Amino acid sequence: INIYQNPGQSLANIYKGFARQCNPGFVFPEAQTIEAWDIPLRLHPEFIPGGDISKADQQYSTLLAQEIANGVTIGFRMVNEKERVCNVEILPLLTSMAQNLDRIKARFGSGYLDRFKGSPNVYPTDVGFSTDASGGISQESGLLVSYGVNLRTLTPGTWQAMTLPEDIKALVGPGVGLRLDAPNFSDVFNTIKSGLRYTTAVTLLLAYFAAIGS
Amino acid sequence: INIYQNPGQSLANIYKGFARQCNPGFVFPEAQTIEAWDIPLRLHPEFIPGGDISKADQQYSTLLAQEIANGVTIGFRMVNEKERVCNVEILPLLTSMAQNLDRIKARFGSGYLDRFKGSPNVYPTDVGFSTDASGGISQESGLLVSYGVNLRTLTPGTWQAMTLPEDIKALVGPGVGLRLDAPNFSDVFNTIKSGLRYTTAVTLLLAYFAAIG
Amino acid sequence: INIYQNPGQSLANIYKGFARQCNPGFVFPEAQTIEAWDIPLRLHPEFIPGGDISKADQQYSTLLAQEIANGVTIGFRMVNEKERVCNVEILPLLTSMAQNLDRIKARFGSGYLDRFKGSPNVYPTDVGFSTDASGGISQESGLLVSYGVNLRTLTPGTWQAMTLPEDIKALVGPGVGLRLDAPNFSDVFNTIKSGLRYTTAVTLLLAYFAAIGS
Amino acid sequence: EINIYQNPGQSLANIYKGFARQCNPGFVFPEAQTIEAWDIPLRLHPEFIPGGDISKADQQYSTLLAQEIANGVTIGFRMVNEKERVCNVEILPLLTSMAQNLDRIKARFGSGYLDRFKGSPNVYPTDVGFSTDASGGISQESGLLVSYGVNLRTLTPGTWQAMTLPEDIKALVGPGVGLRLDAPNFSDVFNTIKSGLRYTTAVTLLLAYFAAIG
Amino acid sequence: AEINIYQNPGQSLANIYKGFARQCNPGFVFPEAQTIEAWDIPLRLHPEFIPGGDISKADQQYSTLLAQEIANGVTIGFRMVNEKERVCNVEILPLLTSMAQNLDRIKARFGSGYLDRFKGSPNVYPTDVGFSTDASGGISQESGLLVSYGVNLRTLTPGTWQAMTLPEDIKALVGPGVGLRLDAPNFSDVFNTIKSGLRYTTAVTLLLAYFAAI
Amino acid sequence: INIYQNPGQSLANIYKGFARQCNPGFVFPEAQTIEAWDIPLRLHPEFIPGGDISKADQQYSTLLAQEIANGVTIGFRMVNEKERVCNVEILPLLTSMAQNLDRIKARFGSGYLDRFKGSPNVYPTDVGFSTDASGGISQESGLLVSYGVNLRTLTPGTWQAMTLPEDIKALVGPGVGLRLDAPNFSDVFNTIKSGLRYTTAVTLLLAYFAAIG
Amino acid sequence: AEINIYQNPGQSLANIYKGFARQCNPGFVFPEAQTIEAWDIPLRLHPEFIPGGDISKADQQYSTLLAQEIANGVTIGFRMVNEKERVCNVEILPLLTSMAQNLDRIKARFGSGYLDRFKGSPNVYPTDVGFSTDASGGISQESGLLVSYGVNLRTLTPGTWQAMTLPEDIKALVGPGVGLRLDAPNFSDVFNTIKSGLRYTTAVTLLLAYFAAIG
Amino acid sequence: INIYQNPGQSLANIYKGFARQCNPGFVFPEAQTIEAWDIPLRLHPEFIPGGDISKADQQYSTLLAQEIANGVTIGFRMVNEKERVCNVEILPLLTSMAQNLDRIKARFGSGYLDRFKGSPNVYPTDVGFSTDASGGISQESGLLVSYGVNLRTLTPGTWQAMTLPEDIKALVGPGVGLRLDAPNFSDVFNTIKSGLRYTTAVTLLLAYFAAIGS
């Protein structure tokens, strides 16, 4: 295996290593973690055209190189930030996603990827504009993140049924209900665009679609 | 004086040192530099409310600290990157601003600060959205940078009439003519927003209003 | 349609009648007239909060009512004063505004409304004070009328380049170049403030911006 | 392909389509109407080019063409200092207004419209002569007859006001409207229009008049 | 009585402008002594222009400037009919007024020997357009425009430019070159626009405004 | 096709018409004419932003309009001035350019366009100031026209090798070797600037680079 | 050998200075290439000093400069006997060293066409002393000293002056003019000290020091 | 200096010696000789890695040793072959290179070294295969020697314009226009490759680029 063609499995492997550092007694949700981090590739198999990795989509590769770079940062931080890395960042993310994946499959069945397709966002980390009825953009628009995470339109019912690790919740919270003409919109847009990673954008996607319509 | 009630003078002094280090012969345009870097505070006296700096606008103060820190980085880079710091970065910026400020004062007159009013942007580094023909924001809108810099409507002619340092042009050029609904819009928005500093946003502001267009 | 949400189309409809009563051959400049008299609502969409005409801005509504009432006086005056009403007041207005709008659109492009922003004036009949170099108001300031008509700095060359109906030129000329501390300033300010209407303020706005500057 | 002698409309339309694009590339150029209008004189008078031999071209016709070329050279120089005035008072209003006038003529007379211009004593579009009584005689009641039937003597204040013309042209011709040949200034007016008109602008005046009359 | 434009240029042109000033406003007080004195300045600086008092040996370039000026008086004559208000109140009376006030400031500051102020540029003719100098007599990339007898546009501050008393038409022509370096994108256009736009009389107007104000 | 997106083809068509009028046996060098007159657009694709001619560069558009107006004049003048128009103005131009272009392609190869890059002139008709031997602009400088034609340094040997139509030769001749500080500089600068056209500037450019050395 | 001082002033004077330097320290590496090139500068700027390659028509002022240079070499020969320490370590070797370094700086900065930097002052001779200019080509009371081929003392900064590599005696001669305005009470004295003190050879030393430092 | 870091100066010094023996009055083109023989080093600074000549590129070092060994031979041959050595081999080589380098400087400008970049050949003595008109190597290709000397496309005009010493002309002549599939290709290729040396490959490179185009 390799990270371009097996992103879930590759990253799962690294995160299984982290989860063991944290607690060898923690049951790593491996099935769900591979499935979740494979979602962007499922939706976009052209990321690896005709199966040759030599022609891999540049933006997709950059995202994976970002995850590699983040995994390096975690190894260094495990040393003197073990109790945050483990109990705020990594284990909550893994538990969260697995539960959220499981509820998506339960609510939407085996065709659940259909909920994610048809968005104008190609990459799981994209931040763009929500659209009006006709598909236009207006000043009533807000943030559309990942594969259909509409923060502008995000209801209180949806928000309160959402299970997100603290760090992702804190990133994305300020964007909920926010109009593009709001004084902090540029800042919040910029902050969410810069703060997302491949893995954490999936984590957000799963939380949203698990809870949507609550 | 201090950097908060006198940003133009304070920054001008730092940059005078950079210029003397680069080129002692180079005549430093002190009056223009001071007046240019005073523009956001003249536009926004609320930044220092009742004249007490301990209550100064936080975003404004942070903008100015970034300039102090960048100044320290510039002086560090003078050893191994003198060619680029001097002849690509600092001297072109100083000349550009003096020429564009004077041009602005010649073409619009002494009341030139009015041309900087009406924008959705409070801070000189702000990056927002231009309004379309209806007066709203739409997919046809684009980047509204600083105090009136409309990258969306920025013309071919205007682009090539603009006197502007290489790095600012490199930063901002991908945003020229760019619509909200462009696939790369988010990226280009992000880059420009992250790339601007107080001094360079004013440099861009002046180049645009001197060239339009 | 109604005069609150559709001021340009409602005022155009009235003026189209007056122009027929004046000269049936006169080609009414409908598109420009509607676009010109909508400008104030275009600049301030909050005048009608959330599409609700009962919550319409009272000062905005009152300016429109005065145009309706003026319309009634115009129809009265057609009998004994047709020659002045038609040839001095109405037809030159309609023609000048259409020409000036078109010129403005040609000089400043589709985003021409921007040239109207940043003034201290909210209403098109507003009369406030010119700025000096400092950013402030002083004795060497003068009249700033409507959305950016700086009478203080308006030059002799610009005055005679402007296409403005007689009745508005005679109203506004006295304030050209006039300082706050001028002995006749208060009387001139009084005369301009009292004689301006919603439609004739827009007429002046377009004449000025067609003829400056840059 | 074409030349100004055999193809005056296309040749002149091409030059003005040039001036219009440097002025404003957003400007929707009315190519069809401009070719047609500036062809009028040659359609009424094909003997200007006897049997398609441009070396036997009519003297007064060739001179009118050289004048237009010379005027185009003047315009090119004026575009350096006075670009705004030339574009937006001169060239663009002439084009839009002349197209509108031709369109109106065609909607109210069909393809048969050239018949309006027929059987004038004026051979050339720039000709300025005398209006005539019922029986075809000149009297002290005569005034100006310009181009292919533009009777200024007989032209009402009303019809004049109904005419859609650029400023340049209303200013030149207005003083002749209603003017008797025994008027103290008639000879000044005659002298000004004769020297002021050109092939191009005489057609502009023709189309404005026939679009308005009756 | 026996004056000519070669030997008596100020008096010759004064006679013509006094006739314009009367066409304009018989109540305008013509500043005759100042106008004669100002327009003689180029000849007083360069007696050479007429070697030994022999006008048949007159300097070609000087003679060409005087012919330019005659040709311009002919066009003003023509423009008096259709553009009298612009001609009189923007172009002519302000020129005469400002020139007289500025010449008087200069005399009050320097006395009868004021002509020495105008010496020392490389420019032989009042309409000359050349380059600003460094401190070493050379031309560098920091040079800009140096026009007429020492009007250094490159080093003129916008403060003193705006303090200068000058006809609008002259401000608009010359303003673009204030502070402008020779490598600016528009320098070549500006250099050449001022070069083609200046005339014997308006260059002297500019010269006196500049020397009064600096 | 149109003149904006297809200047070489639109212009070559018109001149092919003139040349057939001049001599139907004259072999019109069509590939070379089109190639030469597309040069400016190939150096500057931004002249037509994103392929949209409603957004065309205004200065570019103006040069092209001038060439169309000139074509109308050529058509008028063909009646009584056919000998000059053909044997002085048009045929030698087309002949000279095709030969110079072929030589330039042989000498600098397929990437020849890079020889026209990095001048301070954006438009083919631009007239600016050369850089001196030490790399600055000074009184030792002269005229820099189009995409690198240095009239100041133009040697006697280059001049006599140049194959140039006589109207272009008469225009540009006075600028050869002319210093910024010369008494008649400003006069010649003005004359050359006003007298150049899009097609004639391109003709000069190829004559120069075909003859240097 | 088959050279002469009018056509080969650099090589000629270099030949004499190679001799002084060997007197000073046989172990001193004489910068011959830079020395010939530096002292050819005035002739390379004004080839009309020898019109048509004909020394019989040599410019009188040029020749006078060369005569003065010969006379100065004679006096150094005499002072070598009793003032060897100063002649060697204050006057000559520092001059030779400094010109070499300054010239290589100038050539690295501007390339082979460096000579263009030295043009366009109104000074024809390397020892000329004249007036700096305002921005309009004139002289005003803000003007000061303009020396040699563009050494603008009026405009020269006390800092960039300190940064110039220059032998003591030239530094002492020219320092008083730095920034000096023409209405200063010592201007006439300083103007004329510098004028009288300069030689072809030491004017070129000053020229290269300035143009190496000035940017 | 040494031959590794300073190949131009070292070799010019040897050749200055030979020229001196040939004819003392022959002006040695010293600047051009040093510059030309530095070309291969300028293009490949990496030949001396981090300024350490003990790690100098072996092929490049061998090239220069060959030139030292050839110098010794020339010295030996000076006795019984001075005429040929001087008038055929040495004097024409130095004069040709100097003229050619000067022509290349005028033709291509100060960045002329850019003409020598992008070839497949690293060493000046390399012989490879040229690119055909469609951009590939094929049987239509031929000999590409040194930094861009394309013998395959080398025209009759370029051949006659080329200023080249007799021995190089005879070495290289049979390769001109020669195709890869020619029966004598192998022989000529082998001959050119074995017969070239550092100095002479540079002499050829310069002959060609100074003559291309004719």
3-state SS string over F4-32?
CCCHHHHHHHHHHHHHHHHCCCCCCCHHH
Q: How many structural domains does chain G have?
A: 1
Helix/strand/coil (H/E/C) assignment for every residue in chain A: CCCCCCHHHHHHHHHHHHHHHHCCCCCCCHHHHHHHHHHHHHHCHHHCHHHCHHHCCHHHHHHHHHHHHHHHHHHHHCCCCHHHHHHHHHHHHHHHHHHHHHHHHHHHCCCHHHHCCCCCCCCCCCEEECCCCCCCCCCCCCEEECCCEECCCCCHHHHHCCCCCHHHHHHHHHHCCCCCCCCCHHHHHHHHHHHCCHHHHHHHHHHHHHHCCC
Interchain proximity F139–E141, CB inside 8 Å: no
Phi then psi for residue F129, to 5 deg, are: -120, 130
Interchain proximity D25–F66, CB inside 8 Å: no
Least CA distance to C162: which residue of chain E? Answer: E86
Interchain proximity C135–B119, CB inside 8 Å: no
F204, F168 in Cβ contact below 8 A? yes
Distance from CA of G95 to the nearest CA of B (A): 24
Distance from CA of G215 to the nearest CA of B (A): 6
In terms of Cβ atoms closer than 10 Å to its own Cβ (0-12, 13-18, 19+), residue B25 is middle
Residues 6+ positions from E83 with CB-CB distance below 8 Å: none
Handedness of CA H21, H22, H24, H26 (dihedral sign): negative
Q: How many CB atoms lie within 10 A of CB C60?
A: 21
CA distance D54 to D51: 9
Q: Counting every residue, how long is chain D?
A: 214
Comparing CB atoms, the residue among B126, B137, B190 nearest residue A137 is: B137
Distance from CA of G113 to the nearest CA of F (A): 4
CA distance E83 to E90: 11
CA distance H85 to B209: 71
Alpha-carbon distance values, H72 to B103, C120, H78 (Å): 69, 91, 10
Residue D176's CATH number: 1.10.3690.10
CA distance G87 to G100: 18
F140, F132 in Cβ contact below 8 A? yes
SS3 of E156, please? Answer: coil
CA distance A146 to A175: 14
Number of alpha carbons in the 13 Å side-chain half-sphere of residue A209 = 28
Phi then psi for residue G149, to 5 deg, are: -90, 60
CA distance F110 to A120: 42
A147, A125 in Cβ contact below 8 A? no
* Angle value at C-alpha H117, between H116 and H119, nearest 5 degrees: 90
B129, B150 in Cβ contact below 8 A? no
Residues 6+ positions from F72 with CB-CB distance below 8 Å: D3, D4, D11, D12, D14, D15, D69, D72
Q: Which residues of H119-140 are buried (b: 16+ CB within 10 A; e: fewer)?
A: bebbbbbbbbebbbeeeeeeeb
CA distance B106 to D203: 42
Number of alpha carbons in the 13 Å side-chain half-sphere of residue H150 = 23
F124, F40 in Cβ contact below 8 A? yes
SS3 of G129, please? Answer: strand
Interchain proximity A190–B194, CB inside 8 Å: yes
* Angle value at C-alpha H148, between H146 and H150, nearest 5 degrees: 100
Q: Kindly state the DSSP code that residue G48 receives in the 8-state scheme.
A: G
CA distance G188 to F120: 45
Q: Kindly state the DSSP code that residue E62 receives in the 8-state scheme.
A: H
Q: Kindly state the DSSP code that residue B23 receives in the 8-state scheme.
A: -
Instruction: Supply H6's token pair.
Output: 């300073």
CA distance G204 to G209: 9
Q: Which residues of E94-129 are buried (b: 16+ CB within 10 A; e: fewer)?
A: bbbbbbbbbbebbeeeeeeebeebbebbbbbbbbbb
CA distance B24 to G158: 10
CA distance G201 to G207: 10
Structural domain of residue B59, as residue ranges?
Answer: 1-213
Residue for token pair 């002269």: F142
In terms of Cβ atoms closer than 10 Å to its own Cβ (0-12, 13-18, 19+), residue E60 is exposed
Residue for token pair 């966002």: A121
CA distance A187 to B126: 9
Kind plus residue range of the DSSP H or E element containing G151: strand G151-152
Closest CA relative to residue G148, chosen from G160, G130, G172, G173: G130
Q: Distance between alpha carbon A185 and the CA centroid of its chain, in Å?
A: 21
Does a cis peptide bond (omega within 30 degrees of 0) precede residue B213?
A: yes
The resolution of the experimental structure, rounded to one decimal in Å, is 2.2
SS3 of B204, please? Answer: helix
CA distance F209 to H108: 9
Alpha-carbon distance values, F69 to D10, F72, F197 (Å): 12, 5, 11
Q: How many CB atoms lie within 10 A of CB H190?
A: 11
CA distance E88 to G176: 59
Output Rg (C-alpha) for chain E, integer angstroms. 17
Instruction: For residue B20, give the amino acid letter.
Output: R
Closest CA relative to residue G165, chosen from G205, G111, G110: G205
CA distance H96 to H118: 25
Alpha-carbon distance values, H45 to C190, H5, H40, H42, H122 (Å): 81, 9, 8, 6, 11
For chain B, say whether A183 makes contact (Cβ under 8 Å): yes
SS3 of G205, please? Answer: helix
Distance from CA of C74 to the nearest CA of D (A): 20
CA distance A65 to A63: 5
E-only strand ranges, chain E: 129-131, 145-147, 151-152
Instruction: Supply D10's token pair.
Output: 């296309």
E94, E168 in Cβ contact below 8 A? yes
For chain F, say whether B213 makes contact (Cβ under 8 Å): no
Instruction: Supply A187's token pair.
Output: 């800042």
Interchain proximity E86–C155, CB inside 8 Å: no
For chain F, say whether D58 makes contact (Cβ under 8 Å): no
Chain G CB contacts of B25 under 8 Å are: 155, 157, 160, 214-215
H176, H159 in Cβ contact below 8 A? yes
Strand partners, B150: B144
Distance from CA of B157 to the nearest CA of F (A): 6
Handedness of CA G28, G31, G36, G42 (dihedral sign): negative
Closest CA relative to residue E161, chosen from E210, E104, E98, E101: E210
Least CA distance to F132: which residue of chain E? Answer: E140
Residues 6+ positions from A159 with CB-CB distance below 8 Å: A176, A211
**Angle subtended by helix axes G32-45 and G200-213, to nearest 10:** 100
Instruction: Supply D179's token pair.
Output: 């003017």
DSSP chain C: --TTT-HHHHHHHHHHHHHHHH-TTS---HHHHHHHHHHHHHH-GGGSGGG-GGG--HHHHHHHHHHHHHHHHHHHHHHHHHHHIIIIIIHHHHHHHHHHHHHHHHHH-TTGGGGG-S-S-SSTT-EEE---TTSS--TT--EEETTTEETTT--HHHHTT----HHHHHHHGGGTT--TT-TTHHHHHHHHHHH--HHHHHHHHHHHHHHS--
G175, G192 in Cβ contact below 8 A? no
D4, F70 in Cβ contact below 8 A? no
Phi/psi region, residue H26 (left: phi>0; alpha: psi -120 to 50; beta: rest), is beta
Q: Distance between alpha carbon E72 and the CA centroid of its chain, in Å?
A: 14
Least CA distance to D83: which residue of chain C? Answer: C107
Closest CA relative to residue C99, chosen from C151, C23, C165: C165
Interface test with G, best of F134, F150, F153 (most G CBs within 10 A): F134
CA distance G88 to H62: 46
Alpha-carbon distance values, H203 to D148, H157, H163, H164, H208 (Å): 80, 19, 10, 8, 9
Residue for token pair 């007064």: D60
Instruction: Supply D173's token pair.
Output: 């011709």
SS3 of D183, please? Answer: coil
Q: How many CB atoms lie within 10 A of CB H209?
A: 23
E113, E119 in Cβ contact below 8 A? no
Q: Please tell me which chains touch A, using 3 or more CB pairs under 8 Å as the contact test.
A: B
Helix/strand/coil (H/E/C) assignment for every residue in chain H: CCCCCCHHHHHHHHHHHHHHHHCCCCCCCHHHHHHHHHHHHHHCHHHCHHHCHHHCCHHHHHHHHHHHHHHHHHHHHHHHHHHHHHHHHHHHHHHHHHHHHHHHHHHHCCCHHHHHCCCCCCCCCCEEECCCCCCCCCCCCEEEECCCEECCCCCHHHHHHCCCCHHHHHHHHHHCCCECCCCCHHHHHHHHHHHCCHHHHHHHHHHHHCCCCC
Closest CA relative to residue C103, chosen from D87, D56, E83: D87
Q: Which residues of D98-122 are buried (b: 16+ CB within 10 A; e: fewer)?
A: bbbbbebbeeeeeeebeeebeebeb
Interchain proximity D159–C25, CB inside 8 Å: yes
Does a cis peptide bond (omega within 30 degrees of 0) precede residue B96?
A: no
G150, G111 in Cβ contact below 8 A? no
